[PDB]
Amino acid sequence: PRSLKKGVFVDDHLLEKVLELNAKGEKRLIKTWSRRSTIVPEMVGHTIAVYNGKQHVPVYITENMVGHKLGEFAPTRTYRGHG
Amino acid sequence: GKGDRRTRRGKIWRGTYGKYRPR
Amino acid sequence: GNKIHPIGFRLGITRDWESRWYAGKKQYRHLLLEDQRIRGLLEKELYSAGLARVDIERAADNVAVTVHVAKPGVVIGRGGERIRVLREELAKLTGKNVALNVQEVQNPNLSAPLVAQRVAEQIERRFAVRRAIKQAVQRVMESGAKGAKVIVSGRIGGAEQARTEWAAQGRVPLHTLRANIDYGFALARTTYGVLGVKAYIFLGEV
Amino acid sequence: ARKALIEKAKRTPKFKVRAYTRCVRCGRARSVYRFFGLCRICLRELAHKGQLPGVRKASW
RNA sequence: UGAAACUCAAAGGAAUUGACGGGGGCCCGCACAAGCGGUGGAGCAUGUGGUUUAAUUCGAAGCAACGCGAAGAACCUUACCAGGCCUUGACAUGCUAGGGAACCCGGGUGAAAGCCUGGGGUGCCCCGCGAGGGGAGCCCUAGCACAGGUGCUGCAUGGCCGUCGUCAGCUCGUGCCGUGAGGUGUUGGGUUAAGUCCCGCAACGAGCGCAACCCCCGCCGUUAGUUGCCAGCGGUUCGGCCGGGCACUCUAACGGGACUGCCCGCGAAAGCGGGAGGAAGGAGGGGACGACGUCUGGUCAGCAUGGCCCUUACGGCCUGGGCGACACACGUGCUACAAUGCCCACUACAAAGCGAUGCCACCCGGCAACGGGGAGCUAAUCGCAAAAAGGUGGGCCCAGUUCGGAUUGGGGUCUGCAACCCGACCCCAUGAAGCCGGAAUCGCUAGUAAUCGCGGAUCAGCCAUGCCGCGGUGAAUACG
RNA sequence: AAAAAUGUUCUAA
RNA sequence: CGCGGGGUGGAGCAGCCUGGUAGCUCGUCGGGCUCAUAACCCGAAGGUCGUCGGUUCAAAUCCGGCCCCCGCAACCA
Ligand SMILES: [K+]
Ligand SMILES: [Mg+2]
Ligand SMILES: [Mg+2]
Ligand SMILES: [Mg+2]
Ligand SMILES: [Mg+2]
Ligand SMILES: [Mg+2]
Ligand SMILES: [Mg+2]
Ligand SMILES: [Mg+2]
Ligand SMILES: [Mg+2]
Ligand SMILES: [Mg+2]
Ligand SMILES: [Mg+2]
Ligand SMILES: [Mg+2]
Ligand SMILES: [Mg+2]
Ligand SMILES: [Mg+2]
Ligand SMILES: [Mg+2]
Ligand SMILES: [Mg+2]
Ligand SMILES: [Mg+2]
Ligand SMILES: [Mg+2]
Ligand SMILES: [Mg+2]
Ligand SMILES: [Mg+2]
Ligand SMILES: [Mg+2]
Ligand SMILES: [Mg+2]
Ligand SMILES: [Mg+2]
Ligand SMILES: [Mg+2]
Ligand SMILES: [Mg+2]
Ligand SMILES: [Mg+2]
Ligand SMILES: [Mg+2]
Ligand SMILES: [Mg+2]
Ligand SMILES: [Mg+2]
Ligand SMILES: [Mg+2]
Ligand SMILES: [Mg+2]
Ligand SMILES: [Mg+2]
Ligand SMILES: [Mg+2]
Ligand SMILES: [Mg+2]
Ligand SMILES: [Mg+2]
Ligand SMILES: [Mg+2]
Ligand SMILES: [Mg+2]
Ligand SMILES: [Mg+2]
Ligand SMILES: [Mg+2]
Ligand SMILES: [Mg+2]
Ligand SMILES: [Mg+2]
Ligand SMILES: [Mg+2]
Ligand SMILES: [Mg+2]
Ligand SMILES: [Mg+2]
Ligand SMILES: [Mg+2]
Ligand SMILES: [Mg+2]
Ligand SMILES: [Mg+2]
Ligand SMILES: [Mg+2]
Ligand SMILES: [Mg+2]
Ligand SMILES: [Mg+2]
Ligand SMILES: [Mg+2]
Ligand SMILES: [Mg+2]
Ligand SMILES: [Mg+2]
Ligand SMILES: [Mg+2]
Ligand SMILES: [Mg+2]
Ligand SMILES: [Mg+2]
Ligand SMILES: [Mg+2]
Ligand SMILES: [Mg+2]
Ligand SMILES: [Mg+2]
Ligand SMILES: [Mg+2]
Ligand SMILES: [Mg+2]
Ligand SMILES: [Mg+2]
Ligand SMILES: [Mg+2]
Ligand SMILES: [Mg+2]
Ligand SMILES: [Mg+2]
Ligand SMILES: [Mg+2]
Ligand SMILES: [Zn+2]
């Protein structure tokens, strides 16, 4: 994991998007490509569109998934098994 | 064995140092 | 394909380098890139002069490019004006005090890098490839060489089925270290593709 | 996609972690040695020509 | 006795060069045999098939494709996919027109690219107490010429490489034989690692190969003596540390040395068997070195290069994804299944390499990864550094274990803009399969195999258990 | 004095 | 609604008699040998027994109906 001598990582551009919504009485649909930005308490209750390489998957963020990265919830490979 | 990282033998294998192989 | 370069094989026993200098790890590549940028310019400009070997020496923010050549008067030009037309354009890409020297090659037909360029141009001019080889190997032997060997690979005469042709006279001991075998390759571009011209000149054993 | 990748490699990048060595002679990206600026192939072509100062075919 | 229709562009004869034979003869190669260790079963690492996928870029295909191109895929790399963007363009030389700039510091929007923007202020020779007007590195906008393509063809190609095979061979010039292909030479007797050499001979020479010249290792000599070494007197905080010395060890350049030169025996000879001297003996051990050719071998994706093909797109920029997928199958490896072992502590003996946003002594914080301090070294000086197996002491007592270390939970560390996909390391916990592997199959003939560790290239980091090197310990066996 | 069958079409560069 | 026999892995046959146990050859799939294929060698998977119903603790096996498929018979006028 990221050395906590450094901060918790959010790309800033995504972080603005959510702090405006809280201030203005949220929420809008947030479409970002920052799969790496850590889910941060200022996100709970919102829904972020995460680009998995093809589509922006919606992701409703709850309290029990905070320490995670956004990419964890938009998988990149579709499987369905073998014939 | 060399695969057991928690030993003075496995640390020699990965070339690393720790409580189980100090300097 | 299996045979090793006769120059690289003899480097240190019969062939000295074309670039001689020392440079600690911190700037070998920079002097090396410069060395290549120089040779590129001169091999282009001094092509019609009969370029055979660019020696590049270097010491302390200065460089001594020594061009061995068939027709030195072509390189120098009018009284040393075309010579200095390069002595400064060289120093415009050298930055250093880039001293230029010109050397006379005693025999052109004894210079493997030129024989190959001669035959390469003869195919570009659509001469008979078989004849054009036997002619060149003939001149090298008349010029006193102890043995010569010349090779054309490619679409000889534009034949769809590409081919290799060669001829050799005297002897050419590629396995001997004390043999002095000048080697020269030239590339012949034609309308039907590219052609490879290899020249081996046995000069003698030392 | 080659010549525009010789160019993009020379340029200074958005992050120093995005820089990669390319052969100065042929532009190859893999097997390029730091000491020469050359890939493992051009290293062999210039070596045999004698245009590489003081390098000699090793043997032991 | 004996047709025809129809149908083929041959059917044939001898001889030649090859290739082939479950024909022959004579030879060789870890080819078998004799051995020793493995692979095939396990878990994992990696390469591939297949499937999957928006894409899982592309190539490699029996030996000689499969830890191969990849000597470093998180972004870059990247050639694939998705979406957002650019259009003389990221890049080259040339021509114009309008600005008339050169360059450096911002700003709005956006994921970024991009698009829209804002500042100041260009010399060059000029007319100068004037407006300055021009012109010029180089910039920028429009217009073109053109760029660009890892798009296709390795069955159009150069170059480079693999392979047969370091196998002993492949040929030429003149002469001779034959109507001719072609033969002779190069075959034969002997000998060699060898078309190596000897004798013979309608052949006589020659060339490419073999050998040799070259590099490392083995003994001795010269030359040198610091950063290397310490034999012997002086100190000595007891460290070659100081005096001092270069003897030795070493370091690195030039030399000597082995040639069947000598003796016995055989033989016509070349040679072969043995002996002596000698560090080394029959080419001392290892390397580099690969004939004419083969395989329409391999590589247009390293590069080059003909032709075909695309041109607001098959070019270019970006962000994200993918190259790491997983019902399966194969190759190459790592780790082991234990007691000739495992574990902890103490303690010895290497070599070759690397090291100035480098290697890091020592110091404190920390169980540790590491962190903070902080000397020395442009390095025979300072550092990576501990080499490990080993030697000693002690613990485990035959258990799926104090064997094994996969898998998984949690907690950290570090490089990096950033470790979700997808990093490496550290610590607590978890502690799977595996009891020596079916049919089948690999390597090695000596300082080899086996086993032990160490370094380098790539490299921010690293999926390295891979590769290229390095020494430590050190066998078994070959009747044939 | 012999276990053991087979190798699609065109092309031979 | 004259009398017999049969239906079970993909094919062809055991197992039913005597209720509890599904078996044999080929085929199919994974590996191996071969340059490759075949043969050959090493492994593995696939059948709820035509069907419905009954007896029984328990049915491919025993009993009754239906479906399907072969065989025999049909004489005296
Ligand atoms: K009757
Ligand atoms: Mg253990
Ligand atoms: Mg044309
Ligand atoms: Mg290119
Ligand atoms: Mg990089
Ligand atoms: Mg690189
Ligand atoms: Mg005949
Ligand atoms: Mg054997
Ligand atoms: Mg095994
Ligand atoms: Mg296995
Ligand atoms: Mg695939
Ligand atoms: Mg391709
Ligand atoms: Mg890969
Ligand atoms: Mg790798
Ligand atoms: Mg990429
Ligand atoms: Mg990209
Ligand atoms: Mg093709
Ligand atoms: Mg080819
Ligand atoms: Mg080729
Ligand atoms: Mg191909
Ligand atoms: Mg032969
Ligand atoms: Mg003749
Ligand atoms: Mg005859
Ligand atoms: Mg005649
Ligand atoms: Mg003849
Ligand atoms: Mg022959
Ligand atoms: Mg002959
Ligand atoms: Mg022969
Ligand atoms: Mg004969
Ligand atoms: Mg030999
Ligand atoms: Mg003879
Ligand atoms: Mg001395
Ligand atoms: Mg040789
Ligand atoms: Mg081919
Ligand atoms: Mg092409
Ligand atoms: Mg290309
Ligand atoms: Mg398997
Ligand atoms: Mg491995
Ligand atoms: Mg394996
Ligand atoms: Mg280290
Ligand atoms: Mg257990
Ligand atoms: Mg068990
Ligand atoms: Mg245990
Ligand atoms: Mg975890
Ligand atoms: Mg990762
Ligand atoms: Mg046991
Ligand atoms: Mg075994
Ligand atoms: Mg051997
Ligand atoms: Mg071991
Ligand atoms: Mg590295
Ligand atoms: Mg991994
Ligand atoms: Mg290593
Ligand atoms: Mg048949
Ligand atoms: Mg046809
Ligand atoms: Mg059935
Ligand atoms: Mg059946
Ligand atoms: Mg019965
Ligand atoms: Mg019974
Ligand atoms: Mg059965
Ligand atoms: Mg099968
Ligand atoms: Mg074949
Ligand atoms: Mg088969
Ligand atoms: Mg069975
Ligand atoms: Mg019934
Ligand atoms: Mg039953
Ligand atoms: Mg009657
Ligand atoms: Zn290159």
Closest nucleotide relative to residue B20's CA, C1' based? E368
| Chain C interface disruption, residue of D22, D51, D59, most C CBs within 10 A | D51
| CATH number of the structural domain spanning residue D2 | 4.10.830.10
Q: Which domain holds residue A29?
A: 8-83
- A70-76: Cβ within 8 A, 24+ apart: A70/A32, A70/A34, A70/A35, A70/A36, A70/A37, A70/A38, A70/A39, A71/A35, A71/A36, A74/A35, A74/A50, A76/A52
D4 burial type by CB count under 10 A (0-12 exposed, 13-18 middle, 19+ buried) = exposed
Whole-angstrom distance between the N-terminal and C-terminal Cα of chain D? 42
CA-to-C1' distance for C90 and E87, Å? 37
Q: Is D29 exposed, middle or buried (0-12, 13-18, 19+ CB in 10 A)?
A: middle
**Domain that includes residue D57, residue range:** 1-60
Strand residue runs (E) in C32-159: 51-58, 62-69, 97-104, 147-154
Q: How many domains does chain D have?
A: 1
Contact C32, D37 (CB under 8 A): yes
Cβ atoms D6, D22 nearer than 8 A: yes
Q: How far is the CA of A71 from the C1' of E133 (A)?
A: 64
D37-49 burial code (b ≥16 CB/10 A, e <16): bbbeebbebbbbb
Q: What is the DSSP letter of C104?
A: E
**Two structure tokens written together for C75:** 């390189």
Length of chain B: 23
Contact map slice: D 1-60 vs C, CB within 8 A? 24-25, 34-38, 46-54, 56-57
Report if residue A67 sits inside a domain.
yes
Spatial CB neighbours of C16, under 8 Å, sequence gap ≥ 6:
D50
Q: Is the link from the previous residue into A17 a cis peptide, with omega within 30 of 0?
A: no
Residue A1 is assigned to a structural domain of this protein: no
Pairing of β C19-20 and β A56-60: unpaired
Q: What are phi and psi of C42, to 5 degrees?
A: -70, -40
Question: How far apart, in whole angstroms, are the C-alpha atoms of residue C160 and residue B3?
Answer: 60
Method by which the coordinates were obtained: X-ray
Nearest to C25 among D35, D46, D53 (CB): D35
- Enter the tokens of residue A81: 């098994």
CATH 3.30.300.20, chain C: domain bounds: 16-106
CA distance B19 to C161: 70
The CATH number of C16-106, from 3.40.50.1240, 3.30.300.20, 3.40.50.300, 3.40.50.2300, is 3.30.300.20
- Cβ-Cβ contacts under 8 Å, D56 against chain C: 11-12
Residue A32 belongs to domain with CATH number: 3.30.860.10
Beta bridge partners of A38: A69
| Distance (Å, whole) CA A68 – CA A74 | 12
Query: Was D8 annotated as part of a binding site?
Result: no
How far away, in angstroms, is C168 Cα from ligand 26 center?
A: 20
C46 secondary structure, DSSP code: T
Residue A49 belongs to some domain of the structure: yes
DSSP H helical segments within chain A, as ranges?
Answer: 13-23
CA distance C166 to C50: 23
Task: For strands C147-154 and C163-170, give the pairing.
Answer: antiparallel
CATH fold for the domain made of C107-206:
Ribosomal protein S3 C-terminal domain (3.30.1140)
In a domain, A47, yes or no: yes
Q: Check: CB of residue C148 under 8 Å from CB of residue C109.
A: no
